[PDB]
């Protein structure tokens, strides 16, 4: 695994209508990320970095925020080395851009995609 750093790209972000469902994806490239947790953060405009979810190295530990509980489910694929986030039964208070965090050596963040949620 001769690489410079770990690059993280989000996918599946897009506009929704009412309490729909979103399919968020975080693809990592570079170093082996077999052993590292991956987190999901949100960045609402006018507010700081709020933490949303996390997944362990093998997916044995699923730890979530108290703000979104019972509807968000985080999942991992080690072979594709990609972390998914199922979102359902949403409210427009969840409208933010979602960053993907891993700390293989150094703390790494992604570009983020707009997970804008309409009112309905």
């Amino acid at each position: 695994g001769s690489s410079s750093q770990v690059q993280l790209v989000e996918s599946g972000g897009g506009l929704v209508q009412a309490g729909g469902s979103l399919r968020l994806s975080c693809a990592a490239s570079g170093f082996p990320v077999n052993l590292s947790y991956m987190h999901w953060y949100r960045q609402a405009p006018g507010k700081e970095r709020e933490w949303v979810a996390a997944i362990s190295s093998w997916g044995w530990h699923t730890e979530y925020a108290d703000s979104v509980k019972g509807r968000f489910t985080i999942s991992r694929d080690n072979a594709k080395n990609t972390v998914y986030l199922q979102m359902n039964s949403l409210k427009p208070e969840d409208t933010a851009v979602y960053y993907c965090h891993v700390r293989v050596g150094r703390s790494y963040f992604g570009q983020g995609t707009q997970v804008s949620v309409s009112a309905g």
């Binding site: 052993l35 590292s36 947790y37 965090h101 891993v102 703390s107």
Partner: peptide, 8 residues
């Protein structure tokens, strides 16, 4: 510590 992230 090096690969868990921010402590809460």
């Amino acid at each position: 510590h090096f690969f868990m992230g921010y402590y809460r």
